[PDB]
Design an enzyme around this catalytic site. Sequence first.
Site, short mmCIF file in Angstrom:
data_model
loop_
_atom_site.label_atom_id
_atom_site.label_comp_id
_atom_site.label_asym_id
_atom_site.label_seq_id
_atom_site.Cartn_x
_atom_site.Cartn_y
_atom_site.Cartn_z
N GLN A 19 0.82 -1.21 0.00
CA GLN A 19 0.00 0.00 0.00
C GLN A 19 0.86 1.27 0.00
O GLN A 19 0.41 2.36 -0.40
CB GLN A 19 -0.94 0.00 1.21
CG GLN A 19 -0.23 0.24 2.52
CD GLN A 19 -1.13 0.01 3.73
OE1 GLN A 19 -1.33 -1.14 4.17
NE2 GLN A 19 -1.65 1.10 4.29
N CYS A 25 -5.10 0.44 3.54
CA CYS A 25 -5.24 -0.97 3.98
C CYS A 25 -6.65 -1.49 3.81
O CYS A 25 -6.82 -2.65 3.44
CB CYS A 25 -4.78 -1.12 5.42
SG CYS A 25 -5.77 -0.21 6.47
N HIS A 162 -6.66 -1.63 11.48
CA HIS A 162 -5.97 -2.14 10.29
C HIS A 162 -6.77 -3.25 9.64
O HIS A 162 -7.16 -4.19 10.32
CB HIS A 162 -4.58 -2.64 10.69
CG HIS A 162 -3.72 -3.09 9.54
ND1 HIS A 162 -3.47 -2.30 8.44
CD2 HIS A 162 -3.02 -4.24 9.35
CE1 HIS A 162 -2.69 -2.96 7.60
NE2 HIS A 162 -2.39 -4.13 8.13
N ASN A 182 -0.89 -9.49 4.71
CA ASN A 182 -0.80 -8.04 4.93
C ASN A 182 -0.40 -7.34 3.64
O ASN A 182 0.06 -7.99 2.68
CB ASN A 182 0.22 -7.74 6.05
CG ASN A 182 -0.04 -6.41 6.74
OD1 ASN A 182 -0.94 -5.66 6.38
ND2 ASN A 182 0.76 -6.12 7.75
#
Length: 215
Positions: A19, A25, A162, A182
């Site tokens: 990102q 996110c 997140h 992630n």
Amino acid sequence: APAAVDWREKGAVTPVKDQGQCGSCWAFSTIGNIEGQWQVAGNPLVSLSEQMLVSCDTIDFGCGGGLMDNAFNWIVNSNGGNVFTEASYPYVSGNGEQPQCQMNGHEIGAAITDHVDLPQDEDAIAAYLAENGPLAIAVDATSFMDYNGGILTSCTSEQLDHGVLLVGYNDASNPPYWIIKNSWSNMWGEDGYIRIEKGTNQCLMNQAVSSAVVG
Ligand SMILES: N#CC1(NC(=O)[C@@H]2Cc3ccc(c(Cl)c3)OC/C=C/COc3ccccc3C(=O)N2)CC1
């Protein structure tokens, strides 16, 4: 549910993304989810565009932040269920710059019809994951900052901040764990991924689980 699921191995998970210096996110979590749900519904795996959400989603706040549920809402109600491909609408906001929404010159890679919000129940989550594909989830990512590798068993679980992608789990392990994708590049964590203990609501992982519906 099965003893173990890893959607990476079954072809429903694209490579780890980045990102960059943008609070997006929420868009990476949403897209990863749609990518996984679209493949598992029987279609070829295709990379889809976070930039569409960062630049075009008027419910969320681009690099300032957002919510996967609102991203699902925008796609269905504002874009006819359509998600543009990563290739035809590349991610350029990694420096925090935010171009204006560009509706032209892209290819539609996938389509969704609705979204669901899962109960705050790890077993409910595991079953829906095992059935339908990777899932959008929110975590308290406080303990994510110093993570090198291993299974987190005392993850700070105070406040959700997140969005990540839930791609699997493994109960035939000690401790048993979830597998999370992630969006901090493949040079963070376990080649982009993190394992956290399954069954003790690590990182508040059960609190805000969502998924697009395909078909
Ligand atoms: N990357 C990044 C950034 N964080 C986010 O986008 C998080 C990412 C995020 C944080 C927490 C989450 C979810 Cl689902 C997402 O679950 C609980 C929700 C808390 C309120 O979240 C928001 C509500 C409205 C608008 C934005 C947020 C939000 O804070 N979204 C810093 C901007």
